[PDB]
């Protein structure tokens, strides 16, 4: 932490700076967009936007 999250579900990138993530994968969250629907995160595979409710804080 204090910004460490884990993916709840698979999410396939749809372009537009989004990031593919796999259930169980760890992320570090940089922040959220204006309405909180999108979350900008970093994983071992890169950096991009993922659905906010597709992840949850761990540790």
């Amino acid at each position: 932490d204090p910004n460490l999250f884990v993916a709840l579900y698979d999410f396939v990138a749809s372009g537009d700076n989004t990031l593919s993530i796999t259930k169980g994968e760890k992320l570090r969250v940089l922040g959220y967009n204006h309405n909180g629907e999108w979350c900008e995160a970093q994983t071992k595979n890169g950096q991009g936007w993922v659905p906010s409710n597709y992840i949850t804080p761990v540790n």
Partner: peptide
Amino acid sequence: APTYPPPPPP
């Protein structure tokens, strides 16, 4: 961030 909404869970 994208200007369209993300897919709903799950």
